[PDB]
Amino acid sequence: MTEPLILQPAKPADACVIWLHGLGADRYDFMPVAEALQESLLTTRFVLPQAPTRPVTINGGYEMPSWYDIKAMSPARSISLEELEVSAKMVTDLIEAQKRTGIDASRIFLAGFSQGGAVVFHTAFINWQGPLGGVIALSTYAPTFGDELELSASQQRIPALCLHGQYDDVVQNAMGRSAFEHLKSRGVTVTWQEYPMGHEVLPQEIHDIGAWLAARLG
Amino acid sequence: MTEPLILQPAKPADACVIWLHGLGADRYDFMPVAEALQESLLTTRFVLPQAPTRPVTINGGYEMPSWYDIKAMSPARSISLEELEVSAKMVTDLIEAQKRTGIDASRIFLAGFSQGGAVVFHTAFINWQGPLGGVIALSTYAPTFGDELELSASQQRIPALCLHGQYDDVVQNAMGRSAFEHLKSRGVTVTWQEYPMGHEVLPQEIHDIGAWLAARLG
Numbered sequence: 001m002t003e004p005l006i007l008q009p010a011k012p013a014d015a016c017v018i019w020l021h022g023l024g025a026d027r028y029d030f031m032p033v034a035e036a037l038q039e040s041l042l043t044t045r046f047v048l049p050q051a052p053t054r055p056v057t058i059n060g061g062y063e064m065p066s067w068y069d070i071k072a073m074s075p076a077r078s079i080s081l082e083e084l085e086v087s088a089k090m091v092t093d094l095i096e097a098q099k100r101t102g103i104d105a106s107r108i109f110l111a112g113f114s115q116g117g118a119v120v121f122h123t124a125f126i127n128w129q130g131p132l133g134g135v136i137a138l139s140t141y142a143p144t145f146g147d148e149l150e151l152s153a154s155q156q157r158i159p160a161l162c163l164h165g166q167y168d169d170v171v172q173n174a175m176g177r178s179a180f181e182h183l184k185s186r187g188v189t190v191t192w193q194e195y196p197m198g199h200e201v202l203p204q205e206i207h208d209i210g211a212w213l214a215a216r217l218g
Numbered sequence: 219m220t221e222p223l224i225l226q227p228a229k230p231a232d233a234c235v236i237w238l239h240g241l242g243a244d245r246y247d248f249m250p251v252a253e254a255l256q257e258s259l260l261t262t263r264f265v266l267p268q269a270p271t272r273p274v275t276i277n278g279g280y281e282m283p284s285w286y287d288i289k290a291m292s293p294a295r296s297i298s299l300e301e302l303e304v305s306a307k308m309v310t311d312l313i314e315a316q317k318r319t320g321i322d323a324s325r326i327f328l329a330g331f332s333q334g335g336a337v338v339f340h341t342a343f344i345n346w347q348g349p350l351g352g353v354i355a356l357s358t359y360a361p362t363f364g365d366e367l368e369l370s371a372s373q374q375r376i377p378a379l380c381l382h383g384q385y386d387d388v389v390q391n392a393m394g395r396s397a398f399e400h401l402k403s404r405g406v407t408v409t410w411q412e413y414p415m416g417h418e419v420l421p422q423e424i425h426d427i428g429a430w431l432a433a434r435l436g
Binding site: 023024056059060062064071072073074075076078165167168169170196197198200 | 242276277290291293385388415416417
C-alpha cells in the first residue's frame with residue numbers, strides 16, 4: 001500500500017477532497033489539478049490515494065495501479081466487482097480518517113476520474129450512510145448502479161456534479177449520462193456538464209469544479 | 219471466408235478503392251460512405267472485404283470480425299504479427315484480382331479505418347513493390363513502422379492521406395501522427411487532416427476524401 005498524497009491548503013483545512021485517479025495513473029496524476037484548485041479554495045485539503053498495483057486483464061495481466069480489473073472492453077464492459085468493493089471500502093476508511101483530523105463530514109468531497117469515478121459512485125451512494133459534501137465524477141460511470149438501486153434519506157442529500165467530454169471513446173457520454181439519470185430519477189441534487197473533448201480534463205472543466213465546490217463550501 | 223461487397227460504378231470501372239473496416243465491424247460498415255463517394259467518382263469501384271472472425275484477446279476472446287489480435291493496450295501494446303500478415307496477404311490478393319479484372323495498379327487505392335488502416339499501411343509500404351494509386355488511413359497508425367523503416371523507390375511514390383480525430387481516445391492522435399511522420403521522413407507524399415471528433419467518421423472528412431481522390435485520378 002502506497003500512502004495517499006496530502007496537499008496542504010493555504011489556510012488551515014476545514015474541508016477535504018478525496019480524489020481518485022483512473023486506470024494506470026498514480027497518486028501524482030491529479031496533483032496539478034488539486035494545486036490549481038487550491039489557488040482559490042483556501043481551506044480545502046486534497047487527498048490523492050493510489051490504487052493497488054494489480055494485474056489488469058485487458059492489458060495482458062500487466063500489473064499497474066488499478067481500482068478493479070477490466071476483463072473485456074467490448075461488447076460487455078466486464079469488470080471485477082469484488083475488487084471494486086474492496087476499493088469502495090478503502091475509500092470509506094479514508095473518509096473516516098479525515099473526520100478524525102477534525103474535518104466535518106458535510107465538508108468531505110469524493111472525486112474520481114474514470115475507473116476512480118466508478119468507486120466514488122459506489123462508496124457514496126451504496127456504502128455511505130452519513131453526511132457527505134459532494135460527489136464529483138469526471139469522465140466516468142457507475143457499473144454498480146441499476147434499476148434496483150435505492151438511496152437512503154441520507155444518500156439523497158449528497159449533491160453530485162457530473163462531467164464528460166462529448167468525444168469520449170473509452171467511456172461513452174451515454175454511460176456518464178446513465179449514472180447521472182440514475183440519481184436524477186431518484187431525487188439527488190445533481191448537475192451535468194459536457195465539454196468538447198475526449199477522455200481527459202480541460203481547464204474550463206477544472207474552473208467549473210472550482211465554482212461548484214466553493215458554492216458548496218459557502 | 220466471407221466474400222467482399224463490390225459496389226459497381228455508374229460508368230465502366232477504371233479505378234478501385236478497397237476499403238477495410240475497423241475492429242468488430244463488418245463489410246457493410248462503409249457501404250454508405252462508398253455510395254456517397256460514387257455519386258462523385260463515377261468510374262470508381264468499391265470492394266469492401268470483411269476481416270475473418272477470430273478471438274480478440276482484449277475483448278475477452280469474444281469472437282468478432284478482426285484483422286489481427288490485440289493482446290494488450292498499455293503500457294506496451296501487443297498484437298498478432300501472424301494474422302496481420304495473412305490480412306496483409308489477402309489485400310494484395312484483392313489487388314491482383316482487380317488488376318486481372320482489367321484495372322491498372324495506379325488507380326487502385328487502399329483505404330482503412332482503425333484496425334483496417336494498420337493493415338493497409340503494412341501492405342502499401344512494407345509488402346507491395348509495384349505501382350499503387352494511394353493509401354487512405356483513417357483514425358489509425360502503423361504498429362509495424364519503426365526506426366528501421368526503409369522504403370523503396372516505388373513505395374515512396376505511393377501517395378497517402380492520413381486523417382484523424384483530435385479527441386480520439388482509442389487510437390491516440392499521436393499514434394496517427396507518428397505514422398504520418400515515418401512516411402514523411404522517408405520521401406512519401408503525405409497529407410494530414412485533423413477533425414474535432416473522436417473515433418468516428420465525419421461528413422466533412424468523407425468530403426475531404428472524395429476531393430483527394432478526384433485529384434489523384436485527375
